[PDB]
Design a protein around this ligand. Structure first.
Ligand SMILES: CC(C)[C@@H]1NC(=O)C/C=C/c2cc3cc(ccc3cn2)[C@@H](C)OC(=O)[C@@H]2CCCN(N2)C(=O)[C@H](C)NC1=O
Length: 163
């Protein structure tokens, strides 16, 4: 039942590999649906062509700002922002897929993929999925990050959709 979505990642326009995610629609259906629909593009906007604007190795990779490409933009399928659905799931380790935000009830389209356990984010960012296949590609993406998060090459979602 839980949907699977994929990202095809490129590095300076060169294909790197595919990352796939299980979205926990059974526990966070509204949040999972937003990510699913942004991944297919079915509403007329979404993640295809967008970049990962911040990659901190040993922490996380952040993306999903498809309108300003720098962390200041993005929007949900429900409007500019939507509420924190619940905090049932925790940031348990690498691979966790979770919503980025600017405060309570400000979810849009930005998200992050954990590359470490980030337990201090529990109860503040809505976890809604996990990497299924392609964690090795996330690890490869991490090598283009830096301590301050600026990437050393452009890391893009060249294609995305639902499997
Ligand atoms: C509108 C944006 C969705 C929203 N924007 C703002 O809240 C305004 C803040 C911008 C900002 C936050 C920065 C945070 C870090 C490093 C550099 C930053 C540079 N700029 C480290 C400590 O933390 C992260 O990387 C964390 C990891 C978890 C994901 N995650 N980032 C967020 O959900 C941040 C908190 N929220 C935004 O990105």
């Amino acid at each position: 039942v839980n949907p699977t979505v994929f990202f095809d990642i490129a590095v300076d326009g060169e294909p790197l590999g595919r990352v796939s995610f299980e979205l926990f629609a059974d526990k966070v259906p509204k949040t999972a649906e937003n990510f699913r629909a942004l991944s297919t593009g079915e509403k007329g906007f979404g993640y295809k062509g967008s970049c990962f604007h911040r990659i901190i190795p040993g922490f996380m990779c952040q993306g999903g700002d498809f309108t300003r490409h720098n962390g200041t933009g993005g929007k949900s399928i429900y409007g500019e922002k939507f509420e924190d659905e619940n905090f049932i799931l925790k940031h348990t380790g690498p691979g966790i897929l979770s919503m980025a935000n600017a405060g309570p009830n400000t979810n849009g389209s930005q998200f992050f993929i954990c590359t470490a356990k980030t337990e201090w984010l529990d109860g503040k960012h809505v976890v809604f999925g996990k990497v299924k296949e392609g964690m090795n590609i996330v690890e490869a993406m991490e090598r283009f990050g830096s301590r301050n998060g600026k990437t050393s090459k452009k890391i893009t979602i060249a294609d995305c959709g639902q499997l």
